[PDB]
Ligand binder design. Structure first.
Ligand SMILES: [Zn+2]
Ligand SMILES: [Zn+2]
Ligand SMILES: [Zn+2]
Ligand SMILES: [Zn+2]
Lengths: 189, 189
């Protein structure tokens, strides 16, 4: 069944620019791969940061490599409340009018004015697969999960790129709400 | 639309036996009302406890009144993970083969061998409403939630009792996963 995609539960994490990486970890510092992810080229790094908000802070927030053009922080709704901000629901890269935080690293700190979002659930899909299912990049779909806490998720963003592996990304709260874990199978409706 | 029902977002909390109330807060100690809930006679009390598990503790956990015949602890999956336990998904009062933890109050502590659960989402329903919708106690329904993070929750238990107001109860993670909040309106399918 080509409609079955595996689940990747995305914990809170951060993408860093080269400039911000230099500030937080020192000039010329390279991310060290800790664990390779399903999406090709992407990985969880050894490096982590502390996120400080007006209300509180979060420690050991994972940095995901590779480095990107713009810094982006992804936190759960609960994470936001603990920090003392209200990050809006957004797809990756949609950072206009988003709130900021203070990122703290070993070599320095940077207080961002934007880049913090709650991740909108989505499916990374190969263009081959997307072509089969008659799905276009930018589409939204329904996804069903089984089990004692199962249900159907609306507004699942379809993300098609050549450098993609078939996988669904949901944050920790979405996963727990449906009793989903890494490598669980869900179905596109 | 009579199939619509208001949402009550349920944060972690505890119900206490009289015996356990005596231990934690002193013999003869009465729960003090802070804020009444929508369910008749029930209320969030001024009293709070600390929950201690093998891995960590949670402070300021709300006690809900009135007292009951058996102590019951409701926590989210995330809460359980932080405590160092794995509570199963259960309906209220369904406490067979459940993990325990240590409850700490001002006057003493008690270590329970059972009674910790992750709450199964449910709808409290007055018999008149139940008769009008064609629902019975113990039935399970689907509930649709709208909005950017909307979707359809499966396996929603119907709890029919005279001392009930029409209201759906979901925990913090289920609420955040769907961007629901208190007094939001969802619809029974
Ligand atoms: Zn990300
Ligand atoms: Zn993703
Ligand atoms: Zn309860
Ligand atoms: Zn309830």
């Amino acid at each position: 069944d080509p409609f079955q995609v595996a689940v990747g539960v995305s914990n809170r994490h951060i993408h860093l620019s080269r400039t911000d990486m230099d500030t937080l970890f020192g000039p010329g510092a390279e991310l060290q791969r800790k664990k390779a992810m399903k999406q090709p080229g992407q990985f969880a790094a050894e490096e982590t940061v502390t996120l400080k908000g007006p209300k509180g802070s979060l420690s050991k927030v994972r940095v995901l490599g590779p480095l990107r053009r713009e810094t982006q922080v992804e936190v759960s709704v609960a994470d936001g409340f603990a920090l003392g901000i209200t990050p809006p629901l957004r797809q990756s890269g949609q950072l206009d009018d988003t709130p900021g935080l203070t990122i703290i690293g070993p070599q320095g700190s940077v207080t961002k004015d934007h880049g913090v979002i709650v991740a909108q659930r989505h499916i990374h899909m190969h263009p081959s697969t997307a072509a089969k299912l008659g799905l276009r990049n930018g589409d939204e779909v329904d996804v069903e999960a089984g089990g004692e806490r199962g249900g159907v998720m609306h507004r699942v963003l379809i993300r098609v790129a050549e450098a993609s592996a078939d996988e669904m990304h949901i944050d920790v709260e979405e996963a727990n709400a449906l009793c989903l874990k890494n490598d669980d199978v869900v179905r596109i409706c």
